[PDB]
Each structure stands twice: as C-alpha cells, then as structure tokens.
C-alpha cells in the first residue's frame, strides 16, 4: 500500500506515534516519506546482508526475522514480512521499540539526513488529524 501523506499521518496518530519519545507526528511522516516513499511494501538489501522492510525500513539485523540474516536478532519478535502489510500496526509497534533503544530517531538514516532539524510540521500541513 502507498499511503497518502495525511492518511499515514492519521494512522500514525491513531497508533500513538504523535509525540512518542518526544517526536512530533511530522517527524514520523517525514521519516516514512524518505525511508519508503510511503510504500508499505518497500524492501532494500544492506551491504551487511540484512534487509530493511516496510514504510519505516526496519532492519533484519536487529528487529525482525527474515531467515537470511545470519547471527541477527528479532527484538520485535515478528517476521519481517509482517512489516510489509497494508496495516501499519506491526511497523508502528516495532518502531516504538527502535526509537526507545538509545539513539532515538537517529536509528532512521533518512530521518537524520533529510528530516532532523527541518520544518517537519510541513509534513502534516492541511491534514485534519
């Protein structure tokens, strides 16, 4: 599923991401935009042989099991395929764990390089939240 911007903003808010660990909803929408282009089915192989999954590009080296990432963890206790579903529940639950892990939203490289310090409130412009 390729979410709309305000559609994703509304789902993210419903699932309790707006201000989670102090990160405003615009930060989360901005991260999703530059991680996945709002596509729940996005996958990207990493140089270490892990893969990033879903609208928030969650990594198989730590967070989910894809069966092909040796000596990896599964700290969200889910198959990586669960993070590709039209329903963002599993990606949101797992993202809450990631952002709580110590480095906050710096865990998302597209957030750090393209959203951090910018006018992220622009990402929820015009949305009836």
Catalytic residues: 35, 52
For the chain, first and last CA: distance in Å? 20
Closest CA to 76 of 110, 67, 61, 85: 61
Rounded Cα gap, residues 26 and 34, in angstroms: 12
Site string for Na ion, 64-103 (x = CB under 5 A): -x---x--x-x-----------------------------
Q: State the nearest-atom distance from the C-beta of 15 to Rh ion, in Å.
A: 4
Rounded Cα gap, residues 117 and 7, in angstroms: 24
Q: Which residues are annotated as a binding site for substrate?
A: 101
Stretch that binds Na ion, among 14-22, 63-71, 99-107, 118-126 (CB under 5 A): 63-71
Q: Is 101 in the site for Rh ion (CB under 5 A)?
A: yes
User: Which phi and psi (to 5°) does residue 6 adopt?
Assistant: -70, -30
Rounded Cα gap, residues 52 and 129, in angstroms: 28
Q: Is 59 in the site for Na ion (CB under 5 A)?
A: no
Q: State the nearest-atom distance from the C-beta of 69 to Na ion, in Å.
A: 4
Q: Is 15 in the site for Rh ion (CB under 5 A)?
A: yes
> Number of H helices and number of E strands within the chain?
4, 3
Stretch that binds Rh ion, among 40-48, 50-58, 65-73, 101-109 (CB under 5 A): 101-109
Token pair belonging to 111: 């957030």
Stretch that binds Na ion, among 15-23, 31-39, 55-63, 81-89 (CB under 5 A): 55-63
The residues that touch Na ion, with contacts defined as CB under 5 A, are 60, 65, 69, 72, 74
């Amino acid at each position: 599923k390729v979410f709309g911007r305000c559609e994703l903003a509304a789902a993210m808010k419903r699932h309790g991401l707006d201000n989670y660990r102090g990160y405003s909803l615009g930060n989360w929408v901005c991260a999703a935009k530059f991680e996945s282009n709002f596509n729940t089915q996005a996958t990207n192989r990493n140089t270490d042989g892990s893969t990033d999954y879903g609208i928030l590009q969650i990594n198989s080296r730590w967070w989910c099991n894809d069966g092909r990432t040796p000596g990896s963890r599964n700290l969200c206790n889910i198959p990586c395929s669960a993070l590709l579903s039209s329903d963002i529940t599993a990606s949101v639950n797992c993202a809450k764990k990631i952002v709580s892990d110590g480095n906050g939203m710096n865990a998302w490289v597209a957030w750090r390089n393209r959203c951090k310090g910018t006018d992220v409130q622009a990402w929820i412009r015009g949305c009836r939240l």
